[PDB]
Design a protein around this ligand. Structure first.
Ligand code: NAP
Length: 205
């Protein structure tokens, strides 16, 4: 069940690339903000609008949010586990841009670790999780219609469209395919029922 319009942050990442592809195939008119467009597939279905810039730069974010109906956030740091503020700085700029333009809907990916007992989060992942927590707080405090997508391990299994979604939020499987995760990000554009909730998509493959 697919849908049509939007801006994607993090479209060049693992989940971003398939979310972008699914969004264009679905019929969405998609804008992306990318640091470097050579990381978009010079092949795959082409976004309506590519803007080159940095989510840390407010004016770049403002340009990419202008005129959108909703915002999808798949920012991340790849396999870099170092301390970072990119996601929380990005979220702050996204919130400011959404407020200025009257955009209300943001679907943003952090991590299922925000649903764990904090004493059980793997220490090596704590610096990244800290910035996920910072980003989530920014989005919660914004008062915008915010779906918090908190996935467990992101796998590479093909798209099923058959995953489960648990609200607020633990969840019985510890994996979600990147393709199913992107499918779910876009599904969240089709309904208000997850707004203000945390969501944990998962599946057994
Ligand atoms: N198992 C897992 O890996 C797992 C589990 C749970 C949650 N998560 C979280 O899920 C999210 C998505 O992960 P993923 O692996 O699909 O993403 P990823 O491969 O880490 O991609 C990160 C994306 O963010 C973009 N980005 C980074 N810094 C930026 C900046 N300053 N300005 C603009 N764009 C920037 C990257 O662009 P560039 O291409 O220019 O770098 C890329 O598009 C991440 O937050 C991750 O921590 C991951």
């Amino acid at each position: 069940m697919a849908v049509k319009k939007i801006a994607i942050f993090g479209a060049t990442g693992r989940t971003g690339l398939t979310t972008l592809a699914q969004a264009v195939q679905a019929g969405y008119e998609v804008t992306v903000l990318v640091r470097d467009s050579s990381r978009l597939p010079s092949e795959g279905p082409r976004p309506a609008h590519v803007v080159v810039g940095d989510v840390l730069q407010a004016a770049d974010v403002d340009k990419t949010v202008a005129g959108q109906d909703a915002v999808i956030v798949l920012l991340g740091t790849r396999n870099d586990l170092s301390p970072t503020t990119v996601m929380s700085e990005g979220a702050r700029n996204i919130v400011a841009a959404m407020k200025a333009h009257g955009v209300d809907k943001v679907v943003a990916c952090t991590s299922a670790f925000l649903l764990w007992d904090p004493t059980k989060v793997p220490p090596r992942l704590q610096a990244v999780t800290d910035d996920h927590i910072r980003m989530h707080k920014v989005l919660r405090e914004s008062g915008l219609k915010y779906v918090a997508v908190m996935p467990p391990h992101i796998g590479d299994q093909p798209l099923t469209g058959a995953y489960t979604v648990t609200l607020d939020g633990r969840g019985p499987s510890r994996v979600i395919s990147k393709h199913d995760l992107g499918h779910f990000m876009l599904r969240c554009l089709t309904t208000d029922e997850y707004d203000g909730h945390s969501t944990y998509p998962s599946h057994q493959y």
